[PDB]
Write a protein that binds this ligand. Structure first.
Ligand code: CHL
Ligand code: CHL
Ligand SMILES: CCCCCCCCCCCCCCCCCC(=O)OC[C@H](CO[C@@H]1O[C@H](CO[C@H]2O[C@H](CO)[C@H](O)[C@H](O)[C@H]2O)[C@H](O)[C@H](O)[C@H]1O)OC(=O)CCCCCCCCCCCCCCCCC
Ligand code: CLA
Ligand code: CLA
Ligand code: CLA
Ligand code: CLA
Ligand SMILES: CCCCCCCCCCCCCCCCCC(=O)OC[C@H](CO[C@@H]1O[C@H](CO)[C@H](O)[C@H](O)[C@H]1O)OC(=O)CCCCCCCCCCCCCCCCC
Ligand SMILES: CC1=C[C@H](O)CC(C)(C)[C@H]1/C=C/C(C)=C/C=C/C(C)=C/C=C/C=C(C)/C=C/C=C(C)/C=C/C1=C(C)C[C@H](O)CC1(C)C
Ligand SMILES: CC1=C[C@H](O)CC(C)(C)[C@H]1/C=C/C(C)=C/C=C/C(C)=C/C=C/C=C(C)/C=C/C=C(C)/C=C/C1=C(C)C[C@H](O)CC1(C)C
Ligand SMILES: CCCCCCCCCCCCO[C@H]1O[C@H](CO)[C@@H](O[C@H]2O[C@H](CO)[C@@H](O)[C@H](O)[C@H]2O)[C@H](O)[C@H]1O
Lengths: 220, 50, 61, 250, 37, 35, 56, 219
């Protein structure tokens, strides 16, 4: 296309020091900064599969980051969750009262983990089978951008706006995946919720940073 | 101004014990919340803004 | 040496008065800046020399 | 020799019209110094030419070159001297046992039978066991040989400076004050305009070093301490410790 | 008070603060010189 | 009594946001002159 | 205590909020208005060129 | 030898049929070991070669910089902390980080500033390597030469190839040794020179098998 994010004049991941990007990264796909130093996308089929994997990971991680942030914020403000922290919310089902959505005893009130696992397995199996092979909500649609019933508001009719929104989606998804990797590492190292880590850093930025835990995993 | 108050001599602290005098500000309040609370504080009585 | 300091300070005052009276005249007079560069340079250099000398004398008093 | 800029983009000598040619920088601004009064022998050829010559010490181009030789030699010696005056004092004042300390006291440290400690920054500090007379003899012999080589224009073949290209035989044809070749192991002077820019930088840094060494001498004579001590004390107490305070302390 | 070495120059200082005001008046005088062109 | 505070805050915020975003909506080009 | 009060006159809370619902209302209203303005921005004309806008 | 068809291989004599077709002994250190077939595509092969060379050089530097301070401390120099995996924590000491223990050298006390300076300088130099910079622009990505070969040790082609093979072999050895360093530090808990001294003290009991049951999953 003819836009700032496509073609040979697109921005690249090393600024002026990037040089010439790899030949197969011609710049016809969203979020193409020409960063394939490892050379894992030489084969176009592998490139397509990696693009699909990246997009699915991006959407899942956007959802995951939002769902990790929101309950802890609400619990900090005062909502009585069973376990507000993202990496502890799974253990609520072992509590005597069971899992309670929003802390209310009349919302969901789940008791058995086996039923949750079984229903999730069935529903998600059907969902992903429909995603791979066309189902009730469209049959002959694109694998990554089905549109149709999944774009009710008609935000992707204009091809130029469609490309712009694709770039925005991929960029926000990459940011979300980076932040989710940060979530995992901070949970492993610090042991507190991400909002707790942010509050601690804001309280004393000079000392409450990552280096404070640097001497945590040293062997003895 | 910060260097003058911190290293080269000091500033006249009027809240020092007894009558105020020249003092060096060894620990300025750099906390973001405390610093930015003044700006968003109300200007009416009791609060007084900055 | 207060007498020397006071004499130098009075000389500085006189030189500064002469400079502030003359520089606008030299600037605004057509074809005057070209033929009076030396006088203005000497006056400014003398002003700087006198103020520095007064400072040194004050350090000695 | 194709290079790029330090911060990206094209690399080279940028613009050389600021230091060469009729258009250039001068020791006074445009409004105070018109281009007509520039002396005729002060044309945009030599590096670092600001059209500065009150009292007309220079008369014509060959005398200008004769004085340029002395200016460049003095500049390089003053750069070396400024480095060797500043660094050892700062090293000693921070913990190292240099035993020489301030420059104006290092000479007397080697009087009588005394010796001098030499610090190899990265690596240890050694206690150089040479006596004073051996130092004098070695210095005079080596400096005489080197200056005789410089004056004659020819010297021995193939010494060991870590040079990029070995087995130097003849020095004939090398420009005095810029021999290059054997004296340019890294090959940074191959590009001509880059060489001109480097010449300008060299002469400017050298003039700064010359003025700084004169300041070293004068303020060390006045205050009685080394330049590093004066710098640190002035930074610690700007208004308390300066020239005006030092003068007439009693 | 001023330092004793600068004691004799006390009267001059007494005139200094009002000098900037005169500047504005000078401007009008200048306009009178050019007949308010 | 806090419900009144919420209502007043909502109204004031709505009006202030209207004012702020009104002048960001290419206001200087609303003149009737020719340029 | 005879009755109940908000007790926040002289506390100097930021933006005069002492309950998180007030801050949530502030952010929600501001975000809704900003979203409406962002959606309607297409009708205001784009100043993409470097030299554009009212000027003299 | 070390090049062409009749070159040394990763299985010695029993390697005639082991070597893949695409590995034809053209590049240095080509022993024909691609059992997993990860470099069938020539572009991926080139990228892996570049990665291997950079990793080898960094591993050489890392191995030397891990060995040196411990030996120097054994010689009788006070470092504050000589063990390689504990040498980064002395930046938080009250005396700071002093090069070779001398208090007048470096004497760094702030970690954020050092990290920022490293980020800026390393970013600039890595960008220079990728696209070219003050040293040069149009040179080989892996062997620029020119400004990076001052002594001129690589000017005759066969000598250049032999030196390249020596470089790659020393680098592979360094990478293996650095992986050993990591595993030994995780398992044993003492510096590599201390481990060597302990092994020399009594090899029959001071070996890796003494720590076999350390990570038993009993719970
Ligand atoms: C060439 C420049 C040069 C300058 C500016 C000085 C400057 C000085 N030397 Mg020095 N020296 C110089 C060359 C040399 N000195 C010495 C050996 C000495 C000694 C032994 C002494 C000096 C001393 C002095 C000081 C005399 C006052 C003064 C700071 C004296 C001093 O430092 O007293 C405080 C002193 O005792 N110098 C040698 C070796 C022969 C030199 C070689 O060129
Ligand atoms: C003729 C006999 C001969 C044999 C069998 C081998 C075999 C080998 N050579 Mg070769 N070579 C041989 C001759 C020669 N080699 C070479 C030159 C080279 C080079 C330059 C290299 C090799 C390498 C290799 C290795 C490649 C495969 C591998 O990585 O194994 C991996 C699998 C094993 C080693 C088996 C597993 C070990 C053990 C039995 C299991 C351990 C169990 C643990 C306790 C597990 C516990 C952990 C738990 C917690 C999970 C392999 C050991 C490469 C190498 O050494 O990489 C490591 C290499 O770089 N060879 C020359 C010179 C021309 C030879 C001359 O005859
Ligand atoms: C009042 C004081 C309060 C206290 C102090 C607060 C300080 C806050 C400081 C930071 C924010 C300052 C914002 C100032 C207002 C100016 C905003 C503006 O001029 O913005 C103008 C720009 C214009 O953006 C451009 O708009 C263009 C036009 O787009 C249009 O056209 C495009 C195709 O060309 C697409 O089709 C697109 O969809 C279409 O809209 C393009 O899209 C460009 O890519 C795009 O960059 O916007 C942008 O800068 C991007 C948005 C900027 C940040 C906005 C944050 C808003 C709040 C977020 C959180 C809300 C939460 C709500 C929760 C609700 C539920 C509880
Ligand atoms: C990949 C996405 C993802 C995943 C796997 C989860 C997973 C989870 N969330 Mg999170 N969440 C997400 C995204 C996600 N969330 C996002 C995007 C939001 C913002 C809207 C939230 C907001 C949120 C809240 C506020 C809460 C959870 C809670 C939970 C837990 C139980 C949810 C439940 O009962 O499901 C089934 C849920 C439904 C069928 C919805 C019922 C809606 C009710 C009946 C009506 C609405 C309220 C009146 C579970 C760990 C709960 C918890 O225990 O956290 C500690 C909880 O209180 N989530
Ligand atoms: C806002 C202040 C300002 C600005 C933008 C300029 C800008 C300019 N001046 Mg003017 N000038 C100024 C103040 C200023 N000057 C003052 C205060 C003086 C009196 C000394 C002069 C005297 C002067 C002369 C005589 C000439 C110029 C000329 C010029 C032009 C080119 C040479 C140049 O940069 O000046 C060069 C000025 C200097 C080298 C002075 C030294 C400046 C150094 C960097 C000290 C900086 C101090 C520090 C950064 C700020 C101190 C803050 C506080 C203590 C006040 C340029 C358009 C020339 C020109 O246009 O020719 C036609 C010319 O001939 N200026
Ligand atoms: C022409 C300039 C000049 C001169 C005359 C000297 C002369 C001297 N220096 Mg200095 N020095 C210089 C440049 C100079 N240096 C520069 C450029 C540097 C920075 C690289 C230094 C850094 C330096 C240090 C760090 C030390 C000296 C020391 C010395 C003394 C013993 C040198 C010795 O035996 O080493 C023999 C070297 C053979 C290769 C001697 C008085 C030592 C001393 O006693 O300090 C007072 C010492 O510790 N110098
Ligand atoms: C990429 C590899 C690497 C890395 C990341 C480090 C990192 C570190 N080293 Mg190690 N080191 C390395 C390679 C490396 N080293 C090698 C190859 C050697 C052998 C020369 C050493 C020898 C060494 C010693 C002896 C010491 C360290 C120390 C340190 C720490 C302080 C860094 C500092 O302030 O230096 C920056 C220092 C300066 C800029 C001051 C000037 C020093 C110059 C640059 C040294 C240059 C050496 C030269 C180029 C090569 C040797 C030449 C020789 C053959 C003649 C830091 C953890 C110190 C420490 O904390 O002890 C544990 C310490 O005492 N290192
Ligand atoms: C014309 C000349 C203008 C001259 C201006 C001179 C400078 C004025 C400086 C004012 C500083 C204000 C700082 C923030 C104030 C603040 O946060 O208020 C916060 C205050 C405080 O609000 C009260 O706070 C108390 C103390 O905690 C209690 O909590 C009370 O419950 C709470 O209501 O709210 C207000 O007073 C009303 C603010 C909104 C008023 C309408 C503004 C309309 C602006 C339109 C244009 C927008 C562009
Ligand atoms: C580019 C390139 C190039 C060259 O050549 C090579 C290389 C380098 C290799 C490459 C790179 C790559 C990368 C970087 C990657 C990364 C990734 C990631 C990080 C992802 C994430 C990703 C991430 C993700 C998904 C995430 C997700 C999440 C989730 C789901 C979550 C969930 C949840 C929640 C909500 C909360 C609750 O309470 C619980 C749970 C349930 C838990
Ligand atoms: C061939 C093949 C074939 C088939 O087909 C497949 C397969 C098998 C896969 C393949 C194989 C492969 C391999 C083996 C690999 C390995 C690698 C390595 C080991 C690396 C390292 C690597 C390593 C490395 C880099 C390292 C580095 C290091 C460093 C830097 C260090 C640094 C340091 C030091 C000095 C010390 C101080 O104190 C600090 C620090 C800072 C810490
Ligand atoms: C380029 C511009 C730089 C300007 C210099 C910056 C100001 C620093 C120089 C200050 C003058 C030198 O100061 C030095 O001599 C003065 C002599 O009168 C002393 O000043 C003294 O004068 C009187 C006694 O005669 C007393 O009323 C003062 O309390 C006393 O301070 C200073 O105590 C001394 O430190």
């Amino acid at each position: 296309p003819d836009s700032f994010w496509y073609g040979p004049e697109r921005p690249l991941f090393l600024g002026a020091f990037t040089g010439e990007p790899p030949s197969y990264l011609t710049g016809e796909f969203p979020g193409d900064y020409g960063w394939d130093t490892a050379g894992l996308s030489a084969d176009p089929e592998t490139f397509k599969r990696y693009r699909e994997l990246e997009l699915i990971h991006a959407r899942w991680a956007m959802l995951g980051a939002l769902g990790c942030i929101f309950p802890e914020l609400l619990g900090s403000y005062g909502v009585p969750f069973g376990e507000a922290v993202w990496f502890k919310a799974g253990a609520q089902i072992f509590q005597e009262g069971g899992l309670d959505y929003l802390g209310n005893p009349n919302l969901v009130h789940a008791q058995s983990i086996l039923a949750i696992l079984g229903t999730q397995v069935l529903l998600m199996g059907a969902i992903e089978g429909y995603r791979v092979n066309g189902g009730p909500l469209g049959e002959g649609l694109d694998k990554l951008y089905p549109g149709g019933s999944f774009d009710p508001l008609g935000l992707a009719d204009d091809p130029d706006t469609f490309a712009e929104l694709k770039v925005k989606e991929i960029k926000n998804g990459r940011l979300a995946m980076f932040s989710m990797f940060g979530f995992f590492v901070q949970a492993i190292v610090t042991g507190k919720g991400p909002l707790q880590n942010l509050s601690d850093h804001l309280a004393n930025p000079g000392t409450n940073n990552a280096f404070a835990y640097a001497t945590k995993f040293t062997p003895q | 101004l910060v260097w003058k108050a911190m290293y080269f001599g000091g500033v006249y602290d009027t809240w020092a014990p007894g009558g105020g005098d020249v003092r060096v500000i060894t620990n300025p309040t750099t906390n973001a919340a405390v610093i930015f609370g003044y700006l968003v504080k109300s200007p009416f009585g009791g609060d007084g803004w900055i | 040496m207060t007498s020397i300091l006071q004499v130098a300070l009075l000389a500085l005052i006189f030189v500064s008065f002469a400079l502030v009276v003359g520089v606008p005249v030299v600037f605004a007079t057509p074809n005057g800046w070209t033929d009076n560069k030396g006088a203005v340079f000497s006056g400014l250099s003398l002003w700087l020399l006198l103020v520095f000398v007064v400072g040194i004398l004050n350090s000695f008093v | 020799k194709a290079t790029r800029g330090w911060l990206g983009g094209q690399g080279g000598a940028a613009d050389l019209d600021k230091w060469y040619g009729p258009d250039r920088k001068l020791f006074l601004p445009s409004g105070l110094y018109d281009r007509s009064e520039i002396p005729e022998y002060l044309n945009g050829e030599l590096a670092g030419d600001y059209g500065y010559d009150p009292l007309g010490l220079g008369k014509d181009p060959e005398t200008v070159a004769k004085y340029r030789e002395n200016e460049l030699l003095h500049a390089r010696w003053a750069m070396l001297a400024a480095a060797g005056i500043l660094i050892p004092e700062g090293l000693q004042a921070n913990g190292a046992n240099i035993k020489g300390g301030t420059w104006f006291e290092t000479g007397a440290e080697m009087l009588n039978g005394g010796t001098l400690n030499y610090f190899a920054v990265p690596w240890g500090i050694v206690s150089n066991p040479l006596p004073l007379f051996a130092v004098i003899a070695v210095e005079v012999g080596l400096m005489g040989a080197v200056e005789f080589y410089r004056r004659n224009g020819t010297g021995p073949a193939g010494y060991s400076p870590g040079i990029g290209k070995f087995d130097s035989s003849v020095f004939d044809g090398l420009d005095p004050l810029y021999p290059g070749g054997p004296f340019d192991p890294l090959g940074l002077a191959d590009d001509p305009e880059v060489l001109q820019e480097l010449k300008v930088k060299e002469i400017k840094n050298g003039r700064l070093a010359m003025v700084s060494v004169l300041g070293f001498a004068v303020q060390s004579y006045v205050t009685g301490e080394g330049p590093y001590a004066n710098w640190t004390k002035h930074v610690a107490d700007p208004f308390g410790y300066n020239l005006l305070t030092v003068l007439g302390a009693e | 008070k001023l330092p004793e070495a600068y004691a004799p120059f006390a009267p001059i200082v007494d005139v200094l603060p009002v000098i900037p005001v005169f500047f504005i008046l000078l401007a009008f005088v200048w306009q009178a010189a050019v007949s308010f062109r | 009594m806090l419900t009144l505070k919420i209502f007043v805050y909502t109204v004031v915020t709505f009006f202030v946001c209207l004012f702020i975003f009104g002048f960001l909506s290419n206001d200087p080009a609303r003149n009737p002159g020719k340029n | 205590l005879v009755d109940e009060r908000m007790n926040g006159d002289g506390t100097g809370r930021p933006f005069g909020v002492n309950d998180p619902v007030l801050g949530w209302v502030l952010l929600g209203v501001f975000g809704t208005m900003w979203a409406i303005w962002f959606i309607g921005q297409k009708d205001l004309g784009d100043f993409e060129d470097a030299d554009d806008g009212l000027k003299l």
